[PDB]
């Protein structure tokens, strides 16, 4: 349905 993603560092 839905998700919040918090990305690892670039």
């Amino acid at each position, epitope marked *: 349905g839905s998700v919040q993603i*918090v990305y*690892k*560092p670039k």
Partner: nanobody
Amino acid sequence: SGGVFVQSGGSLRLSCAASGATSTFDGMGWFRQAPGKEKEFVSAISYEQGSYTYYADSVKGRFTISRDNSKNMVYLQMNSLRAEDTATYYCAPAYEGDLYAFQGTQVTVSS
């Protein structure tokens, strides 16, 4: 409303239950969201020993993430806290170091 309060320079340890590597997830970590700001990565660790230990630039050298697979626990040692660490801290499962959220610990650090 309510949360933890730490003096600048102080320390704090967080913990999070970690189910173990499912089909979808190979790790656990933490992000944080400060008042009026976006959610920001903090740290992530792999269930597999060696595989990955990511830190945001803003916390390198001060925070340490660790795992105890025997207890299904993950831990964040937060040292040398500063006022800019003030935020709500959330833990989430990780795949390859990215955090997936579908429940938080508010922390205020005073100068």
